[PDB]
């Protein structure tokens, strides 16, 4: 895992390692992660134009490992070249089945609702990073608790919670959604920020803390 950062006006590479990891001594291993040539951070972009991929300048992003992965040579090699592909690899890639986004939001808790799609040319669509998470959460939430053919106790009882719209039912729905969302270890916490009623319609929203 890692933290994101950006190059500030005339910040030296020493300064970063000292502020995040405590000891200045660690900058030496820290430059290898960002694959930097000797002028590790340099102020001017027309100087970055010298050989753009091997430098960072003012306003560019940087990668900051956790201290356990700081010394790993494999983490060094991977962070050297992947650069922005970090986030995608770290939160996953899989096929996109949200083909009909307008449609699956008209029949949830019913089956047969999702479907493969095509993006690019001649290849099934795929989703990555944050949208990988939007897909899996939306599907998982709209799946009943014992309906996948292996590893059951997956999904929700949202199909079971339809009731007289009195507030106890609404807190019950809130708790089920929060349990649903907090099941995946990749998400830290969820909390409600609004629940709202319109006769026979529930509405509400939840904030989820995804790891960096």
């Amino acid at each position: 895992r890692f933290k994101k950062h950006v190059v500030q006006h005339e910040e030296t590479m020493q300064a970063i390692a000292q502020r995040y990891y405590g000891d200045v001594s660690y900058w030496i291993d820290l430059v290898e992660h960002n694959n930097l040539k000797y002028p590790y951070l340099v102020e001017t972009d027309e100087e970055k134009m010298k050989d753009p991929e091997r430098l960072a300048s003012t306003g560019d992003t940087l990668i900051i490992p956790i201290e356990s992965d700081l010394t790993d040579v494999s983490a060094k090699e991977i962070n050297s070249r992947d650069k922005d592909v970090l986030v995608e690899l770290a939160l996953g890639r899989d096929l996109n089945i949200t083909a009909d986004e307008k449609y699956f939001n008209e029949h949830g808790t019913s089956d047969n609702i999702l479907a493969f799609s095509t993006n690019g040319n001649g290849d099934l669509d795929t989703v990555k990073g944050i949208d990988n998470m939007k897909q899996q959460l939306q599907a998982r939430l709209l799946t009943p608790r014992g309906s996948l053919m292996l590893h059951p106790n997956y999904g929700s009882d949202l199909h079971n919670l339809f009731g007289l719209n009195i507030p106890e039912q609404a807190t019950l729905i809130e708790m089920e959604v929060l349990r649903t969302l907090t099941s995946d270890n990749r998400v830290k916490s969820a909390n409600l920020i609004d629940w709202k009623i319109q006769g026979n319609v529930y509405s509400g929203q939840f904030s989820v803390e995804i790891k960096s």
Binding site: L95, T118, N121, G122, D123, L124, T126
Partner: protein
């Protein structure tokens, strides 16, 4: 029910997949759809192969079950040892069954045990007793002079040694051997036939070589173990078990075995002029010995068979083989068996 190789399946699959649309036709190795369909076709290929293998195994098992002709299990190794006393004996002393024999050599730690008692006669000086190996497999086929001690008190015994090697220690019979045995069994249902008497006398597990010689008014049976020595207990057991296949109106006799001796001299021209030392010659002599000693009474020495056996070594190494003495096939008499005598091998 037939094989279909991966690429055949994969092609049929993609060909069907492309029907009804044209937003998929991009199957470079990087594509994920290709990877999935390669994995599915791999699994289907493996399924077909395992199905075919399991069908063969089922056929074999039904053949087992129908006629109750179970495959031979692991066969014990046994032979004979010589006991040597310090002096000629003073009383009718006795060895009980189940006395242990062990080889002092660290390379052959396998043990041996007796099955039937023996009494040594008074004033005797040596005795020959049979020992059976607890372990079963290749480890019982120890070389000559391996069993040194009896692993006991040995107060009146000086040393123990074996003059012949153990050859009866064998691994489990392969499919081919079982098929050969079963085809003789199928052809042996009619009694009063030589091919029937072959199975009749081969039914004992210990017997390996067996031949039957016929004449106008008498039948004779020649058989032996892998070592090539008939025993009285084996003859008795053969007589007891063979009653259900013996011809009614013709007498039968089970006896008769002789070791025919021949000296084999061959000339080998190794392709590599280097590395023509007597070490490789020792290996070649040991392979020739193993080949010749494996024959039985019903087999006969053939030049071409010997050539095949010795040329099992890669033809890049050995380029040419010739015999200086052997120029014609030797016909073994029915009672005798051909085997290696004293072999001499040289480069040129």
């Amino acid at each position: 029910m037939k094989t279909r190789k991966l690429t055949n399946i994969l092609s049929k699959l993609i060909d069907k997949t492309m029907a009804g649309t044209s937003k998929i036709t991009d199957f470079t190795p990087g594509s994920a759809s290709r990877s999935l369909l390669e994995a599915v076709s791999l699994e289907i290929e493996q399924f077909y192969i395992l199905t075919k293998e399991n069908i063969d195994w089922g056929i074999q098992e039904g053949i087992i079950e129908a006629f109750d002709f179970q495959k031979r299990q692991s066969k014990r190794a046994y032979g004979d040892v010589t006991i040597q006393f310090y002096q000629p004996l003073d009383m009718r002393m006795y060895i009980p069954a189940g006395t242990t024999f062990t080889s002092t050599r660290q390379e052959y730690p396998q043990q041996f045990e007796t099955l039937v008692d023996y009494y040594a006669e008074p004033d005797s000086t040596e005795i020959v007793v049979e020992v059976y190996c607890k372990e079963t497999g290749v480890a019982g086929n120890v070389p000559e002079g391996t069993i040194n001690t009896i692993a006991s008190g040995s107060s009146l015994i000086r040393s123990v040694n074996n003059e012949y090697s153990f050859n009866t220690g064998t691994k489990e019979e392969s499919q081919e051997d079982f098929k050969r045995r079963f085809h003789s069994f199928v052809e042996s249902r009619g009694r009063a036939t030589n091919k029937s008497v072959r199975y009749g006398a081969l039914q004992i597990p210990d017997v390996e070589g067996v031949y039957v010689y016929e004449e106008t008014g008498h039948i004779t049976v020649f058989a032996h173990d892998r070592n090539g020595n008939l025993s009285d207990t084996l003859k008795e057991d053969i007589i007891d078990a063979l009653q259900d296949y013996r011809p009614s109106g013709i007498m039968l006799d089970v006896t008769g075995v002789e070791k025919e001796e021949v000296n084999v001299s061959a000339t080998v021209t190794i392709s590599n002029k280097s590395r023509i030392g007597d070490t490789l010659q020792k290996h070649i002599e040991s392979v020739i010995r193993s080949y010749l000693n494996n024959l039985k009474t019903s087999d006969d020495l053939i030049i071409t068979d010997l050539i095949q056996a010795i040329m099992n070594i890669d033809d890049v190494l050995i380029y040419d083989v010739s015999f200086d003495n052997l120029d014609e096939n030797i016909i073994v008499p029915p009672q005798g068996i051909i085997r290696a005598g004293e072999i001499k091998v040289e480069l040129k």
